Amino acid sequence: AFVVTDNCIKCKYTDCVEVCPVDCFYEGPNFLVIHPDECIDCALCEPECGAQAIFSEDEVPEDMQEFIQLNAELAEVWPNITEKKDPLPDAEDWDGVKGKLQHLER
């Protein structure tokens, strides 16, 4: 599985969904996750994310490991998203800001 990690939060560009051949992205108010059972590890979404938030599960930084099960948990409860939409307002201001997990909205 690939995993969405902290910098997606409050940015949510959604550039990643357009290349996902299996549509396994799931949508929160201010964050996206990857459903690890449906994801086929094609890696195509990784270079599409301007916030560089997406990692292969085995390359998730040590300080963001919590995001692995968080993706799995929220992918079960959020609605599927298969089409690009406008990034969140002020996404540029939050791109690069650390510890945005504290801002995650369910």
Binding residues: 8, 16, 20, 39, 42, 45, 49
Please give the annotated binding residues for [3Fe-4S] cluster, written as ranges: 8, 16, 49
Does 8 contact ligand F3S by CB under 6 A?
yes
> Using the rule CB under 6 A, is 11 a contact of ligand F3S?
yes
Q: Is 32 in the site for ligand F3S (CB under 6 A)?
A: yes
- The dihedral over CA atoms of 55, 56, 60, 66, expressed in degrees to the nearest 10, equals 100
> Residue 2 binds which one of ligand SF4, ligand F3S, none, with CB within 5 to 8 A depending on kind?
ligand SF4
Q: Does 68 bind ligand F3S (CB under 6 A)?
A: no
